[PDB]
């Protein structure tokens, strides 16, 4: 029955909150059920207010705990994470497992989008593959999660007015219906719409521009204004770029970047932020600093 598993899943969440990894067998079971839930979700996930929107966390588990202390614990607080859950952090395994665990337990209360690091290629360079091998002794867990990443929605739309995605706009995307037409159940391509949605950046330069990252495109203010008007959007909520103050308005408040990993890579010393969307869809921002690390001056 579902009741027995629900209690089992609850135990996992408590265990994961303590920063204790699940076993390989448990992870496999969790991923399987996650896919069944994610496969039903659209490329543009319809999200209801009120919700709290978060940027990258990059395996900084103890700052994810800080995030919940500031914004409130799931399921009481609705959450919308815009990707980049792994790599560049000592606790990517615990970070991704907890967020996947919460999604399975509270599908309606938490939304997790795909970021550019939710990729087989990227995870093998920036540490998530190494961490899984180190913490389990074999690559199976990495295989499971990377397969799961293929099902994560690319974008979310909040009350039909605020459009949330990791990277940014694309020359190949003019209407949200174009996004709904994409096939996302694949490894992140190096080119095209699904690549741009995860890799693009806003820019001061006008119009489209060459991305210094080697992927995606940079887009100016005129692009954002055209896209918002064409789709009836009030705001593009965005991730994927470090900002020192935690959040950064740009393009005449057509776009806002949110970064939720404080003291990024344990060296940037930046502030983290999360955007709380009221019951009235009115937006608010909470800035927070890294959690005091126990036994680490």
């Amino acid at each position: 029955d579902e009741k027995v598993f629900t209690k089992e899943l609850d135990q996992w969440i408590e265990q994961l909150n303590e920063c204790k990894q699940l076993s390989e067998s448990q992870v496999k079971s969790l991923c399987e059920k996650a896919k069944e839930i994610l496969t039903k979700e659209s490329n543009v996930q319809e999200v209801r207010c009120p919700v709290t929107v978060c940027g990258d966390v990059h395996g900084q588990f103890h700052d994810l705990m800080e995030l919940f202390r500031i914004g409130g614990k799931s399921p009481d607080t609705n959450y919308l994470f815009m990707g980049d859950y792994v790599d560049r952090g000592y606790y990517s395994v615990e970070t991704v497992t907890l967020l996947v665990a919460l999604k399975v337990r509270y599908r309606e209360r938490i939304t997790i989008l795909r970021g550019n690091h939710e990729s087989r290629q990227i995870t093998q360079v920036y540490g998530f593959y190494d961490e899984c091998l180190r913490k389990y002794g074999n690559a199976n867990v990495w295989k499971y999660f990377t397969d799961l990443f293929d099902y994560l929605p690319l974008t979310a739309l909040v009350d039909g007015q605020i459009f949330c995605l990791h990277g940014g706009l694309s020359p190949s995307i003019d209407t949200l219906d174009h996004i709904r037409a994409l096939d996302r159940l694949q490894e992140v391509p190096h080119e095209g719409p699904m690549c741009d949605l995860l890799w693009s950046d806003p820019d001061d330069r006008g119009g489209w521009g060459i991305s210094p990252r080697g992927a995606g495109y940079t887009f100016g203010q005129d692009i954002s204004e055209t896209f918002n008007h064409a789709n009836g959007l009030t705001l593009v909520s965005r991730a994927h770029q470090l900002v020192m103050e935690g959040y950064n308005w740009c393009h005449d408040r057509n776009v806002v970047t949110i970064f939720s990993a404080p003291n990024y890579c344990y060296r940037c010393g930046n502030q983290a932020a999360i955007m709380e969307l009221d019951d009235t869809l009115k937006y608010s921002f909470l800035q927070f600093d890294p959690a005091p690390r126990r036994g680490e001056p």
């Binding site: 290629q121 990227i122 990252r213 080697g214 990024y264």
Partner: peptide
């Protein structure tokens, strides 16, 4: 020293260049 963002952007391009 080196700018924080530029450090990550350059290596991201290298990975994407390697493809």
């Amino acid at each position: 020293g080196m700018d924080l963002i530029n450090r990550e952007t350059v290596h991201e391009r290298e990975v994407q260049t390697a493809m």
